From Swiss-Prot:
A number of inactive tetrameric holoenzymes are produced by the combination of homo- or heterodimers of the different regulatory subunits associated with two catalytic subunits. cAMP causes the dissociation of the inactive holoenzyme into a dimer of regulatory subunits bound to four cAMP and two free monomeric catalytic subunits. Activates cAMP-sensitive PKAI and PKAII holoenzymes by interacting with regulatory subunit (R) of PKA, PRKAR1A/PKR1 and PRKAR2A/PKR2, respectively. Interacts with NFKB1, NFKB2 and NFKBIA in platelets; these interactions are disrupted by thrombin and collagen. Residues 287-339 form the AGC-kinase C-terminal domain. It is found in: Cytoplasm; Cell membrane; Membrane; Nucleus. This is cAMP-dependent protein kinase catalytic subunit alpha. One of its GO terms (molecular function) is manganese ion binding. The modification Phosphotyrosine is found at residue 319. Ubiquitously expressed in mammalian tissues. It comes from Cricetulus griseus. Residues 32-286 form the Protein kinase domain. It is an enzyme of class 2 (transferase). Belongs to the protein kinase superfamily. AGC Ser/Thr protein kinase family. cAMP subfamily. Allosterically activated by various compounds, including ATP. Activated by cAMP; the nucleotide acts as a dynamic and allosteric activator by coupling the two lobes of apo PKA, enhancing the enzyme dynamics synchronously and priming it for catalysis. Keywords: ATP-binding, cAMP, Cell membrane, Cytoplasm, Kinase, Lipoprotein, Membrane, Mitochondrion, Myristate, Nucleotide-binding, Nucleus, Phosphoprotein, Serine/threonine-protein kinase, Transferase. Autophosphorylated. Phosphorylation is enhanced by vitamin K(2). Phosphorylated on threonine and serine residues. Phosphorylation on Thr-186 is required for full activity. Phosphorylated at Tyr-319 by activated receptor tyrosine kinases EGFR and PDGFR; this increases catalytic efficiency.
């Protein structure tokens, strides 16, 4: 374990140096060609772009400053960029450039052509336990890394897990990630993945990520999430009850792990006990996992996504292609000074 302690100490040193002195303004919009819209939201979109001089493809997240302000996401968007420019881990999508202009904020990330885990999960129905375990191990290591930096991720769900050319996970969307020593209070995340303490408006901590991992593993192995209902209010009632029904095809080890991750009492939840992540890593469901081999990407993946090359968009969906305009006048300059 000294090797792991020293790895995490170095990881924190390197994070803190970038955290304290964030990079800014490392590209500009007219250095890229727009290719395709890969995703949208209420205040931003993600575009496939190509750098005009190098030919490299990237996933460019574009946030409209005026909408970020209106939807009360200022602090969250500053968190997202400051954290992304400071982290470095094999299963996190890398931020290559960031910049802003009169209208928008831009985060230029590596493009992962294999698509969201969500698509592959829905296509296949459910993943076998070995397949879910391969992905789950990556998330465990990623959360060990993030939590050691005092970061809470807060948006684990299949849509945010991209599958790369080797079949490994790259986590995207740090819009809810936050550096938290102690507790935090914001209501955020997708309903099916919210821990009870979020729904109950409590001060919560990194244990919410371990709850979300329980939801993710259940959904991967069953094909649907454990607290499924038609409307958020009904989902929330199921979550706080914590009553779960496991499919009979689940192994006993999987059920036991999930009862401990989907523990309503955060003080009893795996990942949040005295032994921290080691209660998860040492659980019988992970007995076949070589944690070092996973980290080193030496395990052959269950599944390699089909795609033709680094510019292929076939694993992503089709969206209306809308203008990306830049106002002649600066909007919300003060709010985004640090970006
Ligand atoms: C003998 C045995 C080997 C592997 C597993 S396993 O738990 O790794 N996989 C299970 C078998 O097929 C289902 C879907 O994966 C699971 O219940 C269980 C039992
Ligand atoms: C965060 C992290 C912890 C351990 C390792 S590890 O490769 O030392 N294996 C456990 C890699 C990454």
């Amino acid at each position: 374990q000294e090797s792991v302690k020293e790895f995490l100490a170095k990881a924190k040193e390197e994070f803190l140096k970038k955290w304290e002195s964030p990079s800014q303004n490392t590209a500009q919009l007219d250095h890229f060609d727009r290719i395709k819209t890969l995703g949208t939201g209420s205040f931003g979109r993600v575009m496939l772009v190509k750098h005009k001089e190098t030919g490299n493809h990237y996933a460019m997240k574009i946030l409209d400053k005026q909408k970020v302000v209106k939807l009360k996401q200022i602090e969250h968007t500053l968190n997202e960029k400051r954290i992304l420019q400071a982290v470095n881990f094999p299963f996190l999508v890398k931020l290559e450039f960031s910049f802003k202009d009169n209208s928008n904020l831009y985060m230029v990330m590596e493009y992962v052509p294999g698509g969201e885990m969500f698509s592959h999960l829905r296509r296949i129905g459910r993943f076998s336990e070995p397949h879910a375990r391969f992905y789950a191990a990556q998330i465990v290591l990623t959360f060990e890394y993030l939590h050691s930096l005092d970061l809470i991720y807060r948006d684990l769900k299949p849509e945010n897990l991209l599958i790369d050319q080797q079949g490994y996970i790259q986590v995207t969307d740090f819009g809810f990630a936050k550096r938290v020593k102690g507790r935090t209070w914001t209501l955020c995340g997708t309903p099916e993945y919210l821990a009870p303490e979020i729904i109950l408006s409590k001060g919560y901590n990194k244990a919410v990520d371990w709850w979300a991992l329980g939801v993710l593993i259940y959904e991967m192995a069953a094909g649907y999430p454990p607290f499924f209902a038609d409307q958020p209010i009904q989902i929330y009632e199921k979550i706080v009850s914590g009553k779960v029904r496991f499919p009979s095809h689940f192994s006993s080890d999987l059920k036991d792990l999930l009862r401990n991750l989907l523990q309503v009492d955060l003080t009893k939840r795996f990942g949040n006990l005295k032994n921290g992540v080691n209660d998860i890593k040492n659980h019988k469901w992970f007995a076949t996992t070589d944690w070092i081999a996973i980290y080193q990407r030496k395990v052959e993946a269950p599944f390699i996504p089909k795609f033709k090359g680094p510019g292929d968009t076939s694993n992503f969906d089709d969206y209306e292609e809308e203008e990306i305009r830049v106002s002649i006048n600066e909007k919300c300059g003060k709010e985004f000074t640090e970006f």
